[PDB]
Design a protein around this ligand. Structure first.
Ligand SMILES: O=c1ccn([C@H]2C[C@H](O)[C@@H](COP(=O)(O)NP(=O)(O)OP(=O)(O)O)O2)c(=O)[nH]1
Ligand SMILES: O=c1ccn([C@H]2C[C@H](O)[C@@H](COP(=O)(O)NP(=O)(O)OP(=O)(O)O)O2)c(=O)[nH]1
Ligand SMILES: [Ca+2]
Ligand SMILES: [Ca+2]
Ligand SMILES: [Ca+2]
Ligand SMILES: [Ca+2]
Lengths: 257, 257
């Protein structure tokens, strides 16, 4: 799905969000931090499905929420990948250098099913049993620091669930920025404001964005900016507290220098 | 901490709760089900701690909630252990028969610390970094079906956090029963009723119970019955909808026949 130059641009966005949280995030964060964050998000993903046999039987999967949780994993996976790229070779943990088969047991659904390219995520993801096996595997990828592999898995999940991964990433990226501006660190952010969850507003912010537009080498920057603005406008954020893509790219290009 | 005959009696309680959920639970449930449930609970446990570096900085650990989450893991671990005991030898998965070192990477805190007997959980559990390493290990035990090992870990955690594991188990066991009577399956249960979480009521139901009383070979049944009644009374449950220990033991003894 995603061209290399687009993925590089997403990483730059991720770098800027991470730096907003902590200027020297590479020096302060650890590979285990990102692995933990992914593990935690993966359980939020699974909680979108009616996996419990003792509660809410015959509930249908919250597939809309799944979009969000996939994008959250993606943020942490991009982060872990560049944490790895920045890790000196002699500080790379053994689990990430050993054969994958030696550090992971792979889980499979009972019923026959499509797979992603690797042997890890299963379709359709409308199916609870496919989702369970999928994200038990993701947690084991995380534990073995295979952030790049997790990234591929997410793109295929997004393909199957029939949503625009990149568009959703920019929307949530923007919300993540918004939360840091609005007291997320000090506990004053109202995440569920008047019964409504902040994530739930993001869907309407991406209805107007096409698959070709968000990945198109010429069009992507304008399209990402329009998602950004939609999200900032949805949260009543003043113009002067906003950033655009170019700005995130600029902050990354000087962070690299 | 816990004598063998007491653990056997807890298993009988667990068997009865599981049968209330599904009469033939051994035939319908799988080892992966219990492993998944433990994985999910372990993330709820970790969410009691200020592990996030981007939210609610300098929050203190919800150690009271930790008690509950530990007991939830215990319920699923007892369940997995007797699922294993009931699994024909040729259906036992390889991960549970291989050397533990071959199916698990063990996580350690950075700072020096006490351990439980096995090499898996770290003290004090007032420390976020100890908790993180502890439950990343628990999830890997779960994935390798080491339910009995998880059980030992929980007893040592309870020792360090200075609470009565068995007393808390009976209280939550009773609440689990109460939820099944009150529409948990069909979605009509009010878990957060008037802003208050049901689990949060359980603490006052165990203040009057001592460590010696709940494990004492003569006294344990009366003590467990009094916790049971306290919990049923805390949720306004009519006498005729209650069960006592003897009753759970009786239901187990005929389920075995
Ligand atoms: O250094 C970071 C830290 C967080 N994040 C982002 C990624 C992810 O999209 C987001 C997740 O934040 P939370 O887990 O705090 N909340 P979420 O959006 O999952 O809702 P919930 O509170 O229900 O978990 O945090 C970063 O990108 N970089
Ligand atoms: O077959 C089962 C299924 C559930 N259980 C119990 C064990 C555990 O104490 C309890 C957990 O139920 P939930 O996860 O539904 N709710 P919890 O108490 O963790 O609160 P929350 O909804 O916040 O997860 O279910 C059994 O004992 N046997
Ligand atoms: Ca989260
Ligand atoms: Ca999330
Ligand atoms: Ca739970
Ligand atoms: Ca729980």
């Amino acid at each position: 799905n995603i061209p290399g130059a687009i993925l590089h641009s997403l990483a730059e966005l991720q770098d800027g969000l991470n730096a907003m949280i902590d200027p020297s995030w590479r020096a302060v964060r650890s590979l285990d931090n990102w692995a933990l964050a992914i593990t935690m998000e993966s359980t939020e993903l699974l909680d979108s499905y009616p996996w419990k046999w003792w509660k809410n039987l015959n509930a249908t999967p919250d597939l809309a929420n799944v979009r969000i949780e996939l994008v959250d994993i993606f943020h942490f996976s991009l982060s872990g990948a560049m944490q790895m790229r920045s890790t000196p070779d002699d500080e790379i943990p053994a689990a990430s250098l050993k054969p994958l088969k030696e550090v992971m047991t792979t889980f499979l659904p009972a019923k026959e099913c499509t797979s992603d390219p690797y042997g890890f995520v299963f379709f359709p993801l409308t199916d609870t049993q496919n989702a369970i096996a999928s994200f038990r595997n993701i947690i084991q990828l995380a534990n073995a620091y295979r952030f790049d592999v997790i990234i591929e898995c997410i793109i295929y999940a997004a393909e199957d669930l029939g949503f625009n991964l990149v568009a959703y990433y920019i929307a949530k990226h923007t919300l993540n920025c918004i939360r840091q501006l609005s007291g997320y660190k000090d506990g004053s952010y109202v995440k569920v404001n008047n019964g409504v969850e902040d994530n739930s507003l993001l869907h309407n912010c991406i209805k107007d964005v096409s698959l070709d537009e968000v990945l198109d080498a010429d069009k992507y920057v304008q399209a990402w900016n329009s998602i950004m603005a939609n999200v900032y406008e949805a949260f009543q954020i003043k113009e002067s507290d906003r950033k655009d893509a170019e700005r995130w790219f600029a902050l990354a290009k000087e962070n690299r220098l």
